[PDB]
A paper describes a structure:
Argonaute proteins are programmable nucleases that have defense and regulatory functions in both eukaryotes and prokaryotes. Here, we describe a new class of pAgos that uniquely use DNA guides to process RNA targets. The biochemical and structural analysis of Pseudooceanicola lipolyticus pAgo (PliAgo) reveals an unusual organization of the guide binding pocket that does not rely on divalent cations and the canonical set of contacts for 5’-end interactions. Unconventional interactions of PliAgo with the 5’-phosphate of guide DNA define its new position within pAgo and shift the site of target RNA cleavage in comparison with known Argonautes.
The structure of PliAgo was determined by single wavelength anomalous dispersion (SAD) method with SeMet labeled protein at 3.28 Å resolution followed by extending the final resolution to 3.1 Å with a native crystal. To elucidate the mechanism of guide DNA binding and cleavage site selection by the newly identified D-R pAgos, we determined 3D structures of apo-form PliAgo and of its complex with 5’-phosphorylated guide DNA (P-gDNA, 18 nt long), either in the absence or in the presence of Mg2+. All crystals were formed at nearly identical crystallization conditions and belonged to the same space group, containing one PliAgo or PliAgo-DNA complex per asymmetric unit. A crescent-shaped PliAgo molecule contains the N-terminal-L1-PAZ domains on one side and the L2-MID-PIWI domains on the other side, similar to other eAgos and pAgos such as TtAgo.
Residue numbers in the entry: -1 to 766
The structure:
């Protein structure tokens, strides 16, 4: 009975008969709107309405955005809102909307949820042992869980609570972690130490009011010095933290050193405000500093993460009173039986097909399958699906590295390519650029790369360039990698791939051989250079030249899908047709930061398709889109317009049906799924990961797939992937099923489980 899987969905009781929703308004200042700016207006405004008037102000509508008030407001000031900036008139079309939490699935299921959500964390914000970093964030203890030299580990739980699959509403929970340094920033921290920190985030322990904020400006006054005025008499912020302090106000908040730093930041509603440096505690960004003995702490075995969540539910959310003081969370999670998805069968080269076996208990048969994807890809009887010779290549090397270990590395690297893709016959020209001549920063490195390209020294179409790493942290993003791709593709005719000098320059030493210096490999600490050469041959060369190793024999529900991602004013569109036999990626620049226009979406896709349409050997009649993040209604506009138009021409059946979906890799309402194993000694309550194809549908618009799961996880607990329906006619169970199939095309690392579907995974590697 392994199929029996428990969730972190706790049923909710006490809302049977709790209709509490009652009104409606309408927007009028939108006369100049952006199709993307208009939606930053509302949000800044519902916050001021929810946070000033401190009752539930909820706003989640279609087309022209609308707001729910309570009839209980004293004086709303409807036409008197942002008379400061734009003057929206809040037209009261208020029809009493009285929502019940058992109704059939309605469009104001969106509102029934943002209301439940505002009021269910009032008993959590008023607790005292519990602090919330910001609006709608997990709820963390004031007390840390581990001490952990220099820096405190705080545990917590995220509670969001959307629809239930056996009717009604319920609770969703995930544990969480957060790393904060032990000892406040301090009142003998000077001006230069304080600047060195603008735009980190700190935990500001105010009084009993603990929250999080990002630095903006080391202020112009110290803690004691008079800066703002309550009576025009400047008063010192020590004075201000007293005025706003409460009865038994703690010691720290009324005995600050006046000779200490003061920081600035902007409220959740965009107000300027200060905070003493004493009382501010910096959050370790442990992906910023590669603290991999600080990541070996955030990974939580399954039976823990269950026990942490169950413990939090029983201890904090039980007696729970807001007006209607009912609504007790039922403190036994949701469980179902379900059928888990088998892996798809796949097509390797010379028509040999891998299909999972259905005699072996699911487990032993999938480790078989997932290892086959590698052994088959390498085996020369079968091997790559697409076998053919490579068109001309070019490996482009820093001249500092052509003279030191270039040749050894290039020799091994070409060797590695031919033992992986023998049919290609790899043989790349070896060009160089003069990495020491001009500058050594991103400009200059670029001037040398461009100067070489100018000369026409790069014959051939496809290139692989080796570059240098300029700055640390993963949030930096290599502006140089991206920019070499941009210029090389756009001004010259090139499809470019990128590796970096640092990583192989670890795997080569100089030994002295036969009266000459010579470079040979090394395998000590550092990088595993045999594995690195293998993986970079596959990713940068075989995939870089669009030679797919294995491609999904049997068809998906969609006939075409399309990833989309915009981050840092760059948009990325992928496209997967046939079984994976047809794949494109295209890049184009986005006027909005992360948002994309609607004329641009309609165009990029009508041009990226129609190139490939003759190869698609069907009438094409079920298209899907996957969006990385929020799918803004600008985008969804052109999405149907694109395919409606192709429904006229004849490129499609006339009855096409497009569908938009949002893949939440950072899921707004997270969840875990477990299942069980006779409690062994080791494991008191016998909690393992759910088996790899496990899936769960809550609503018609929300479900989770295990793209990562039991047989092939290496350690930790599996993170179900939250997808959310956004438009269009496709069964969400079908969408989850072939998002799982698209996540079994594990191209960059075959024997491993990949969490994202191939569509949006390429969106993420394509912008590094």
């Amino acid at each position: 009975s392994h199929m029996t899987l428990e969730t972190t969905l706790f049923p909710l009781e006490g809302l049977e008969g709790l209709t509490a929703s009652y009104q409606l308004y309408a927007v009028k200042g939108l006369s100049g709107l952006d199709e993307t700016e208009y939606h930053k207006n509302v949000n800044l405004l519902v916050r001021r309405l929810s946070f000033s008037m401190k009752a539930p102000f909820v706003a989640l509508s279609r087309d022209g955005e609308q707001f729910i008030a309570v009839p209980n407001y004293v004086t709303e000031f409807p036409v008197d809102h942002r008379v400061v900036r734009a003057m929206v008139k809040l037209v009261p079309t208020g029809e009493p909307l009285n929502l019940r939490f058992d109704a059939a699935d309605d469009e104001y299921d969106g509102l029934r949820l943002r209301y439940l959500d505002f009021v269910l964390q009032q008993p959590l914000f008023a607790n005292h042992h519990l602090w919330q970093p910001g609006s709608g964030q997990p709820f963390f203890h004031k007390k840390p869980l581990k001490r952990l030299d220099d820096v405190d580990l705080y545990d917590g739980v995220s509670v969001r609570a959307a629809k239930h699959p056996e009717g009604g509403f319920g609770i969703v929970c995930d544990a969480r972690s957060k790393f904060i340094t032990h000892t406040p920033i301090g009142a003998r921290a000077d001006r230069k130490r304080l600047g060195k920190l603008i735009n980190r985030s700190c935990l500001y322990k105010m009084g009993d009011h603990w929250y999080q904020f990002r630095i903006d400006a080391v202020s112009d006054w110290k803690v004691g010095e008079p800066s703002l005025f309550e009576g025009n008499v400047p008063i010192s912020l020590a004075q201000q933290l007293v005025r706003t302090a409460g009865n038994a106000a703690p010691k720290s908040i009324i005995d600050l050193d006046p000779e200490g730093g003061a920081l600035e930041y902007f409220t959740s509603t965009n107000e300027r405000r200060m905070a003493p440096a004493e009382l501010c505690f910096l959050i370790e960004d442990t992906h910023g500093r590669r603290a991999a003995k600080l990541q070996r702490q955030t990974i939580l075995s399954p039976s823990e993460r269950r026990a942490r969540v169950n413990g939090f539910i029983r201890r904090y959310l039980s007696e729970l009173n807001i007006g209607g003081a009912k609504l007790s969370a039922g403190a036994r999670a949701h469980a179902f039986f379900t059928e888990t998805h088998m892996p798809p069968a796949l097509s390797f080269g010379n028509g040999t097909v891998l299909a999972p076996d259905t005699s072996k208990d699911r487990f032993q048969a999938m480790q078989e399958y997932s290892s086959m994807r590698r052994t088959m890809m390498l085996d020369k009887k079968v091997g790559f699906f697409h076998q053919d010779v490579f068109p001309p290549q070019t490996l482009l090397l820093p001249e500092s590295v052509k003279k030191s270990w270039g040749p050894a590395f290039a020799s091994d690297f070409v060797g590695t390519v031919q033992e992986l893709y023998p049919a290609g016959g790899y043989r790349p020209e070896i060009i160089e650029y003069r990495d020491k001549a001009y500058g050594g920063g991103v400009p200059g490195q670029m001037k040398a790369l461009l100067e070489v390209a100018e000369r026409g020294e790069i014959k051939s179409g496809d290139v692989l360039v080796m570059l240098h790493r300029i700055n640390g942290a993963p949030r930096a993003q290599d502006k140089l990698a991206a920019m070499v791709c941009n210029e090389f593709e756009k001004r010259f005719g090139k499809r470019v791939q990128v590796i970096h000098s640092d990583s192989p320059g670890r795997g080569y030493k100089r030994i002295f051989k036969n009266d000459k210096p010579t470079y040979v490999q090394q395998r000590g600490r550092g990088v595993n250079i045999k594995g690195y050469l293998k993986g970079a041959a596959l990713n940068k060369v075989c995939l870089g030249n669009s030679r797919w190793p294995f491609v999904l024999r049997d068809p998906l529900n969609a006939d075409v899908t399309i990833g989309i991602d915009v981050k840092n004013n760059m948009a990325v569109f992928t496209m997967v047709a046939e079984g994976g036999r047809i794949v494109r990626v295209q890049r184009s620049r986005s006027r909005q930061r992360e948002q994309l226009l609607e004329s641009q979406v309609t165009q990029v896709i009508t041009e990226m398709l129609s190139k490939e349409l003759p190869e698609i050997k069907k009438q094409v009649q079920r298209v899907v889109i996957h969006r990385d993040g929020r799918a803004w209604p600008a985008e969804i506009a052109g999405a149907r317009k694109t395919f409606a138009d192709m429904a006229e021409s004849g490129l499609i059946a006339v009855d096409a049906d497009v569908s938009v979906f949002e893949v939440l890799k950072s899921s707004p309402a997270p969840l875990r799924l477990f299942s069980f194993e006779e409690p062994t000694q080791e494991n008191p309550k016998g909690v393992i990961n759910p088996v790899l194809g496990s899936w769960l549908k809550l609503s018609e618009n929300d479900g989770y797939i295990c793209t990562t799961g039991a047989p092939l996880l290496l350690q930790g607990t599996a993170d179900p992937l939250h997808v959310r329906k956004a438009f269009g006619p496709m069964a969400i169970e079908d969408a989850l099923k072939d998002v799982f199939d698209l996540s079994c095309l594990t191209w960059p690392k075959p024997d491993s489980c990949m969490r994202l579907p191939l569509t949006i995974k390429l969106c993420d590697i394509a912008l590094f």
